[PDB]
Amino acid sequence: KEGVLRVITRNSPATYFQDRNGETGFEYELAKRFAERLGVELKIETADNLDDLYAQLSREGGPALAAAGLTPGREDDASVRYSHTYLDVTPQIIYRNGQQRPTRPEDLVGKRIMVLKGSSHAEQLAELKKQYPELKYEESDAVEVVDLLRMVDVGDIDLTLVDSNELAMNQVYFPNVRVAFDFGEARGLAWALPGGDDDSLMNEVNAFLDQAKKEGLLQRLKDRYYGHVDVLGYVGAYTFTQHLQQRLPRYESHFKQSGKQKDTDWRLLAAIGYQESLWQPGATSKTGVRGLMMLTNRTAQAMGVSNRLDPKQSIQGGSKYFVQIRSELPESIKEPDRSWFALAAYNIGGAHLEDARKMAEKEGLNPNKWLDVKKMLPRLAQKQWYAKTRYGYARGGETVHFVQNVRRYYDILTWVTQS
C-alpha cells in the first residue's frame, strides 16, 4: 500500500534536519502539515546536491515532490512543474566586513566567489559572465549555504550569492557577514513536482498552499524559524553576579533539593538553568521550550512536570533529564568529561553527539575526551563532513558555546560558594 508522500529536500538548517527532538525545519514542517491534510505518512528523502535532487525528482519513480526552498525556472519547460509560492525572497551578494563593499555587479570580478553547484545562483552568475566575460566563480556539490556563509565569515572566499532568507536565518551565527546588494527582483519560492499528465497531486499541493497562506500558517512558519535564537550568549560577570543577588535566592533551594535527590552538584544544575533562562521561570521560545530549564512539552511530560512554569517543577524536571542523559552515556566516558558530554547531549541531542564521537574516532582522536569531540562538533555544520554522518547537519558550534558557557557559570558559582 502507498499512503506515503515521498518528499525530497536538502539536509540544511532552512529546509530539513535533525535536532534534539527529531525532525524539524520550515520545509519539513510545512510538508508534514500537507501529508496530514492528505491522510498519508510523510517520508523525507534528502539529496546529495541540487543536481541529484532534480535527477531524483524527474526519474520514474521517483519522489512525489521537492520541498527545498527552490526558485521556479522557465514555464515553459513543463519537464519540472512548480507550485504556488510560499515564501518571498531576494538573492543578495554577500561580502565580509573588513574587506570592501562591492556596489555594482561588475565589482564581482577578480574576487573568489563560491555558490552551490546546480543552483539558481550559479545561473545568475553564468548569465552575468556574459556581460562581464572575465567574471570567475566556483561551484561545488560538497557545500551547502551554511557552508558558504561560514567561508565568507572566516575569509576562505570573498563573495557568495544566496537567497535573502538564508541570511535571515544564519546571519546571527556569522558576525562578519554583510549584505552588499540585492541581485535580482523579489521572487517566490515554490515546491517542484515532475511533469506531468496527472494534475491531481499538483492541484492538491496548491490547494494546500493557498489555504495555508490564509490560515496564516506560512507566516507562523516564517516566524518560528526565521526568528533568530538558539544558544544564549555569555552575559559577563557583571550581569551574572547581579543575578546571583537578584534571582538565585529564589531558586537556590530548589536547585539544592534536586541535587540531593539525584546525587549531583547542585551548582551545575543552576549553571544549566542560568544558561537556559537566565533564571527566569516564565521564559519562552517559539521553538517550543518553556520554563526555567527551557523544557519541551514532550520532555516536561516525561519528567513529571505538570506545569513548565513552576520553577520547582522545571528545575526537578530538567535536572532529572540532565542526570539521566549522563547515565545513558557509554561507560567509556569518565568524569569530569562525562558531564561535559552530558551538557552537549542536553543541547544537541545524543544522536548527533554520537556522530561527533565516531567522527572523532575515525580522525584518530579519543571519543571519550571532551576536548577532542568538541573539536569535531562544529564540523556537523559542514556539508562535506556532516553528509558522511548518520543524522547529518547540526549547528554544533552552538553546542560548544552552550557547554563552555554553562561551564563558566559553573566555575563562578563554585568559586562563590565553597567556603
Partner 1 sequence: XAXKXX
Residue 361 a catalytic site member = no
CA-nearest of 152, 192, 161 to 89 is: 161
Interface with partner 1 (CB under 8 A), residue total 31
H or E element in which residue 148 lies: helix 145-154
Residue 339 interacting partner from partner 1, Cl ion, none (CB closer than 5 to 8 Å by kind): Cl ion
**Binding string, residues 6-45; x marks residues near partner 1 by CB under 8 A:** ---xx-xxxxx--------xxx------------------
Kindly state the smallest distance separating residue 335's Cβ from Cl ion, in Å: 6
Residue 333 interacting partner from partner 1, Cl ion, none (CB closer than 5 to 8 Å by kind): none
Which residues pair with residue 163 across a beta bridge? 91
Instruction: Confirm if 2 and 201 have CB atoms less than 8 A apart.
Output: no
Residues 307-336 that bind Cl ion (CB under 5 A): 336
| HSE-up (13 A, CA, CB side) for residue 89 | 25
As a whole number of angstroms, the distance between CA 358 and CA 123 comes to 38
Residue nearest Cl ion, CB atom distance: 339
If one counts every other C-beta atom within 10 angstroms of the C-beta of residue 50, the result is: 19
Separation of CA 16 from chain center: 8
Of 207 and 416, the one with the shorter C-beta distance to Cl ion is: 416
Q: Which of 65, 70, 212, 403 binds partner 1 (CB under 8 A)?
A: 70
Kindly state the smallest distance separating residue 171's Cβ from partner 1, in Å: 13
CA-nearest of 165, 231, 157, 272 to 397 is: 231
Of 86 and 370, the one with the shorter C-beta distance to Cl ion is: 370
Residues 72-131 that bind partner 1 (CB under 8 A): 72-73, 89, 116, 119-121, 123
Residue 316 DSSP one-character state: H
**Binding string, residues 257-296; x marks residues near partner 1 by CB under 8 A:** ----------------------------------------
Cα distance from N-terminal residue to C-terminal residue, the chain: 68
Of 177 and 272, the one with the shorter C-beta distance to Cl ion is: 272
SS3 content of the chain, % helix, strand, coil (to 5): 50, 15, 35
339 binds Cl ion (CB under 5 A): yes
Kindly state the smallest distance separating residue 28's Cβ from partner 1, in Å: 8
Phi, psi (deg, nearest 5) at residue 279: 55, 55
Kindly state the smallest distance separating residue 336's Cβ from Cl ion, in Å: 5
As a whole number of angstroms, the distance between CA 228 and CA 68 comes to 20
Residue 93 interacting partner from partner 1, Cl ion, none (CB closer than 5 to 8 Å by kind): none
68 binds partner 1 (CB under 8 A): yes
| HSE-up (13 A, CA, CB side) for residue 18 | 18
354 binds partner 1 (CB under 8 A): no
If one counts every other C-beta atom within 10 angstroms of the C-beta of residue 119, the result is: 21
Residues 141-170 that bind partner 1 (CB under 8 A): 145, 162-163, 165-166
Write down the catalytic residue from 27, 166, 276, 354.
276
Of 18 and 313, the one with the shorter C-beta distance to partner 1 is: 18
Instruction: Confirm if 113 and 137 have CB atoms less than 8 A apart.
Output: yes
Kindly state the smallest distance separating residue 11's Cβ from partner 1, in Å: 11
For residues 64-96, one letter each, b for 16 or more C-beta atoms within 10 angstroms of the residue's C-beta and e for the rest, the string is bbbbbbbbbeeeeeeebbbbbbbbebebbbbbb
Residue 195 interacting partner from partner 1, Cl ion, none (CB closer than 5 to 8 Å by kind): none
Instruction: Confirm if 49 and 117 have CB atoms less than 8 A apart.
Output: yes
Of 86 and 346, the one with the shorter C-beta distance to Cl ion is: 346
Instruction: Confirm if 345 and 325 have CB atoms less than 8 A apart.
Output: yes
* C-alpha grid cell, residue 360: 572523532
Of 336 and 364, the one with the shorter C-beta distance to Cl ion is: 336
Of 116 and 323, the one with the shorter C-beta distance to partner 1 is: 116
* C-alpha grid cell, residue 132: 562581464
Residue 70 interacting partner from Cl ion, partner 1, none (CB closer than 5 to 8 Å by kind): partner 1
Kindly state the smallest distance separating residue 400's Cβ from partner 1, in Å: 24
Kindly state the smallest distance separating residue 23's Cβ from Cl ion, in Å: 32
As a whole number of angstroms, the distance between CA 296 and CA 287 comes to 9
| Bond before 196 cis per omega within 30 degrees | yes
| HSE-up (13 A, CA, CB side) for residue 416 | 17
Of 106 and 123, the one with the shorter C-beta distance to partner 1 is: 123
**Which residues bind to Cl ion, rule: CB under 5 A?**
336, 339
Q: Which residues are catalytic?
A: 276
**Which residues bind to partner 1, rule: CB under 8 A?**
9-10, 12-16, 25-27, 50, 67-73, 89, 116, 119-121, 123, 145, 162-163, 165-166, 189, 225
